[model samples]
Target: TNSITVRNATFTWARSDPPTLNGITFSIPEGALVAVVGQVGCGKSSLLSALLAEMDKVEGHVAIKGSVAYVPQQAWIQNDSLRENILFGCQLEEPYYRSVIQACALLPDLEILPSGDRTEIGEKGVNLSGGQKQRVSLARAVYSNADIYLFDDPLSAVDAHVGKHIFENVIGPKGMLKNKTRILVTHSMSYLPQVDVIIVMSGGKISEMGSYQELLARDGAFAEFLRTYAS
Candidate 1:
């Protein structure tokens, strides 16, 4: 329980015996960055959800050490001060909070807000733009300082440039949680190379698992994924 380990696990969303994900086995060391990439409906989100116990653990094991912080594909925001949304009632530490905001690329948004971090957002963040809401959501996750982070296609919500900034400053190898273990469900094949491990899922099963270069060299699922998503 000192790292993330999933041994021959199966997770199901439906009541039926067949699971959404089967024979999911992988071991990610502490502080590792593992990326899960696949076509739509290939169970990427389901995999992350399974870790959160949102699905039925039909078989095998899922173990993780330390706490986890998750940012869903669609971020959830509140009708409260921007700062409050990030703080989420946690005691404020000025320096750390500032770093979180900066890491999340939220400083630019805060600068334009009427009251900076104190600005009150409308109900369900009605007043903030989509990208702004996602950044705030990421800030909240980063501020929590969890040992592991689960990101479910968060980068897709923001613009390409903004997403790059957030990845470089907040979620990438040198980001705020650089030393924390992270499992990211991503569609962008461009980011795979930086991850310590790359897992390709197909039809609810792990089709392949290896480094970015390794998979590409094999010209397998991940390689075709790269070609399909090639810009």
Candidate 2:
């Protein structure tokens, strides 16, 4: 009832009995960065998907008044040039377009391409490195400039070095993201320092939610999850 609230919310996968999430009630401020973590199939993505759908079938309330954009786990690529890949979703002013590319760490890579931005990437940007493809996809999202950004496992495919590069050069530089609402579904704890809140999922429920300090101290689901993943 305050900024945003979900009251008695519940949802389940298709043909599955018993909801994946149940009796969920929480309030999130309009502009807050919330990190959502969980083991595989623990309903993290399901929750985000339901929220994106405006609670069409969710049992309770999910009210949002701002624009929302999502970057799913796997990026999409077209049978086209590197530049075209970033510009697919929404067009931006020329200046902003360049800025978004820079934010997503595509500047130098774009320069080296034989055709620069116009280089034919073929289907799915398959010619480029995995990191390059992802940067282009990320630049597309940055260019969209939505109020809320949903990052569902954006860094899973990236190697250690490039992954860190994307986070620092791309995601961290934007003041838009700093002030904007972000819901991140991730397995990487290294980036945990940059997030404002953390939610851990297990057994189809929000097993824990708190600041990094609180999470690390008690070191419950998220802590153990990271420990397992890290080792």
Candidate 3:
């Protein structure tokens, strides 16, 4: 089943402004892991926003089949206990909750906290570091058990070691959400080869799409991207 589809779509930040994303078209099958990569201003994050319908849909269609979980570039946290933040409004399932924490690599951070997962966050008790907050956000999404995940450069906040850990435990093919559709907006090239599909964006449009090998063999936009940035 296809989890997401965007056909010849165009989106704008405001109705009066010109389209920021044009001629965007792609479909993601259920359980597949797709990577969206591009330069800083290439609308990679905008693509995710388009999927969430956060912008003005000026033309075409956008459809998603299942519930979605999003992890934006900046982590969002409330002035609540860590556990409460992760749980949001869902009832706690002990095993799954623990697994989510472990998978997001929050176990170590929690261990150092005064009240562990119950420790208050934000300005109330203690402010978590950027990476910590990001993991907490990710843990929340994992706990939500959504059918599709949209990750916006989540790995950028953490160290390479922790990023790799999170990738392996939470976002990769062997990860906890292995059966769900995942769309990652990332600048990291090390992960390019592992994804089932790669969508290359440029100037607010999809410039290329394929597997790493296929794109590399084509020696086109994706290959040039790797040559310039993958070093």
Candidate 4:
């Protein structure tokens, strides 16, 4: 139950005839964890973008209170030291900056770096691993102080253990998203157990909406999808 709502929503980008999000409707009470799952191009990303009012074309009613922040699938880190990249565009005190870095899992990654957390990312932190970048991005989001977080396939490229570490340490119930709205788009159905609700999308519409047990019990399309993924 978080601070988000979508009622009779639909969205289509310019020059595109078909709507990416079609007649979608859902409500998240305050401080809930909602995981949106579906195949590729099922409007998960577009729906989120539309909810945040970032999309150019949107219809229906979508309302959200407080602030909403998006931690994109990628972080564009310019040529700068790791510290600077983490503290990009911020003038917070050094203590605050250190605390943020510590929360971002910078310590583990920094241990292996020649320059530690000060290592030059070189022309953007593109040199970091997928996990490293995700960690940094997550840390930035944690410190952003937003009430809601929209993560689009945030851990798509991460390994299981590493992803688990970040999820548990940075985004878990006891972590940053403990009392906030955390909506994530993920393809992995196994992660459902950790989330409160699982929204399945198909043909640009919400095919099913419920907890893992609720959706997996019926002969719903999402149940079948689970079979396919499990197989």
- By descending lDDT, how would the candidates be arranged? 3, 1, 4, 2
Candidate 2, residues 121-162: lDDT per residue as tens digits?
Answer: 866443777667777777777777887788888766667777
TM accuracy, model 4: 0.88
Q: In angstroms, give how far residue 45 of model 2 lies from its true place.
A: 1.8
Clash pairs (backbone) in predicted model 3: none
- Listed per candidate, the RMSD to the true structure in angstroms reads 1.6, 2.8, 0.9, 2.4
Q: TM-score of each candidate?
A: 0.95, 0.85, 0.98, 0.88
Worst 10 residues of 3 by lDDT: 222-231
- What is candidate 3's TM-score against the reference? 0.98
Clashes of each: 0, 0, 0, 5
Off by over 4 Å in 3: none
Q: Highest lDDT: which candidate? A: 3
Clashes, model 2? 0
Q: After superposition, how far is residue 172 of candidate 3 from its true place, in Å?
A: 0.3
Q: Give Cα distance to truth, residue 104, candidate 1, Å.
A: 0.9
lDDT agreement with native, every candidate:
0.88, 0.73, 0.92, 0.75
lDDT preference between candidates 2 and 4, better one: 4
**Comparing 1 and 4 on TM-score, the stronger one:** 1
Candidate 4: pairs in clash: 1-29, 1-30, 1-32, 2-29, 77-124
